[PDB]
Every structure is written in structure tokens, then in C-alpha cells.
Amino acid sequence: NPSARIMTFYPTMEEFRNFSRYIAYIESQGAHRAGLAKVVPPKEWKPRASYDDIDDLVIPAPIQQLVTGQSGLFTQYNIQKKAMTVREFRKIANSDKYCTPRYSEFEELERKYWKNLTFNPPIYGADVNGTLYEKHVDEWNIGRLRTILDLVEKGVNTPYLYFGMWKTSFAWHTEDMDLYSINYLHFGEPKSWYSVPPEHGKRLERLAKGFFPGSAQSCEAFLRHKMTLISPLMLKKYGIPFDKVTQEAGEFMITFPYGYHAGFNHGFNCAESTNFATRRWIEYGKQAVLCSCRVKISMDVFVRKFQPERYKLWKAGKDNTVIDHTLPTPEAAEFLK
Ligand SMILES: [Cl-]
Ligand SMILES: [Zn+2]
Ligand SMILES: [Zn+2]
């Protein structure tokens, strides 16, 4: 993948059955170079039979997202609201005040998103501790991915739900500890995404530091606050390489270590997310620039199990390793030959 473009995968039931193995395969194809990838599950596969029974589910901390800014540069302020049900949320999402505008092409809804993001602050039913997967579903269960991340246990290994409405957005960020993430769109309107290849993440970081010097002087890793919104036109103007994709109901999105992403919701929808790891991530986690002011994992456990050679060297602070973002996960051995 020398273009480092967002790749889409259509695994067959046999390919899909093993998660970490498929993640290894996609990586062998160079999916990780984009920072983001799309996986379409086999037609037969459904994580839940019906999403009709979830009306009385509680969103405990709804956030009214207030955006301030101009000419492609913005800051999102999350005003916590009183707990509400999925029924209360769906009624607001679909109301004449908060419903999706009329549009033809996606290019139109995007244009409208970046014009109106500062007006009529929507509510986002974000970071809801729970799962919509049924107990019995073994393939790609966000609640139990059984990645090397489980070594921490031996609360970022838990799943979170997101109830979105038109114009609700997520700011530019990599995952905490520069981890991988899985995002499944359970039902509803699409979710649009923007991605910066990990090989260019430092150019986005540099750009963001230039625009928000107050923020940068206050916290080294200020993008981790998940408050910074940057227009694709601003990225294009400052020559930051990026790509866009639209995830539709019943699709999976994978974010890779140090793969900056941001996006917005088209209308009323629900998506489940969690973090996961591969052997590749261990150097990403060790090297990660964290938020000072303000999720932190002690790498020691991983460096003792997978890098025993470099353990005494790293503990000392002599492990001068340099991350190659083009390199696939060791696990992709069986798929690279
Ligand atoms: Cl327009
Ligand atoms: Zn994310
Ligand atoms: Zn901070």
C-alpha cells in the first residue's frame, strides 16, 4: 500500500472466524499504512438478532457538544447533560431541530457539516459502558476480542456504545497508549471518518501546535483531550496527507497504532467500540507521548513477555528503537510468505 489509502476487506466466514489472525492478514496487505481500514462482515453474520428492545437503555452522560472557531479550525466543548434513555435520545435525534438535512451526494452533507458545526449544538450519547452483542456470538466480539491486550488484566479492555445524531463529532486523536480500535456500526445513519497515515502523524501534530500554542504550552499531548477539530480543506492547504471513508450500518472500522482520526455522524445511529493490541503495538505503547494534565498502561508486563532481550536496556532508558510505520505486525508471517 504505497499510496497509504483506506482499504476495504470482505472476509469470508472462514477468514472472519479468527479476529487477531484477520487483523494480521489485513496488515500483510498494508492496511495499517492508511491508519484506518474497513471490514465488511459475511452476510450471515449478525451480533444481535433485533435492536428493538434497547429503548429503555440508559445513556448516563449525554454530552452537548459546543464547537467554537472559524476558517476550518475549531474547539469542541463537551457540556455533560442529565442521564437519558435511548428512546429520549432517538426522539431528539429525529426532531425537526436536530434531524439530518436534505442532501444528494456525500460531498453536500460534508460541506453542510463544516458550515454549520458551530450552530445548534447537538447531543452525543458517548462512552456508554455496555455491549449490544448477544452472549453466544463468538466471532469479532468487542466485549471479548482475546488480543494480547488482556495481559493488563493478568478498564480500556471493556466495550463502550455511542448513540449519535446529525453533526455530532469526534475530534482529531490517536487512541490512548497509541492502541488499535474496533468500531462496529450496529444500526442507523452512516459515520464519516478522516484519517492521517501514522507516517505523517507528526506533521498533523506540528500543524496543531502551530494553531493552538496556548493548548501546546499547557499540555505536550493536547490532541488527546479530543477537542481539536480541523477541516479537510485546512489539511489540504497545509499539505497534510489524509483520506476519508464513510462507514455504514453493519460495518467495522479498524484504527491502527498512531493513526490519527476524526469524523462526524450523519444522523441517528449506534456504534460499539473498544481497544485492542498486537505484538506490533508494544513499541507504539512504549514510545507513546501521553497527556500530562489528566488512560495509562505500564508497558513492563509486555516488555517482559515479548521483548525479554531489550527489557534491561529499556528499563535503563537505553532502548533507542525507531518505529517503522510501514512494517506489518510480526503475526502476519503466515500471510507474507
Ligand atoms: Cl452545498
Ligand atoms: Zn478513536
Ligand atoms: Zn493534557
DSSP sequence for 165-202: -TT-EEEEEPPGGG-EEEEEEEEES-EEEEEE-GGGHH
> Does the annotation count 309 as an active-site position?
no
Kindly state whether residue 298 falls inside one of the protein's structural domains: yes
Class of residue 298 by CB neighbours under 10 A (exposed 0-12, middle 13-18, buried 19+): exposed
Kindly state whether residue 1 falls inside one of the protein's structural domains: no
Ligand having the closest approach to the CA of 289: 3
Kindly state whether residue 153 falls inside one of the protein's structural domains: yes
226 φ/ψ sector (left φ>0, alpha ψ -120 to 50, else beta): left
Half-sphere exposure of 267 (CA within 13 A, CB side): 18
Residue numbers of the domain that contains 310: 6-337
Amino acid, single-letter form, for residue 171? A
Kindly state whether residue 214 falls inside one of the protein's structural domains: yes
- Which positions ≥6 away from 301 have C-beta within 8 Å? 151, 152, 154
> Does the annotation count 173 as an active-site position?
yes
> Does the annotation count 175 as an active-site position?
yes
- Check: CB of residue 212 under 8 Å from CB of residue 228: yes
Ligand having the closest approach to the CA of 114: 1
Give the number of residues written for the chain: 337
- Cβ atoms within 10 A of the Cβ of 287, count? 15
Structure determined by: X-ray
Kindly state whether residue 233 falls inside one of the protein's structural domains: yes
CATH number of the domain within which 176 lies: 2.60.120.650
> What is the whole-number distance in angstroms between the Cα of residue 237 and the centre of ligand 1?
20
> What is the whole-number distance in angstroms between the Cα of residue 231 and the centre of ligand 1?
15
- Check: CB of residue 118 under 8 Å from CB of residue 67: yes
- Cβ atoms within 10 A of the Cβ of 21, count? 14
Kindly state whether residue 108 falls inside one of the protein's structural domains: yes
Kindly name the residue from 32, 186, 200, 261 that is annotated as catalytic: 261
Kindly name the residue from 155, 214, 239, 317 that is annotated as catalytic: 155
Angle at the Cα of 89 from the Cα atoms of 83 and 93, rounded to 5 degrees: 145
What cell was used for 168?
455530532
Kindly state whether residue 239 falls inside one of the protein's structural domains: yes
How many domains are there within the chain? 1
What cell was used for 288?
507513546
- Which positions ≥6 away from 217 have C-beta within 8 Å? none
> What is the whole-number distance in angstroms between the Cα of residue 323 and the centre of ligand 2?
21
- Check: CB of residue 292 under 8 Å from CB of residue 319: no
> Does the annotation count 266 as an active-site position?
no
> What is the whole-number distance in angstroms between the Cα of residue 12 and the centre of ligand 1?
39
What residues does 275 pair with on adjacent strands?
Answer: 181
> Does the annotation count 44 as an active-site position?
no
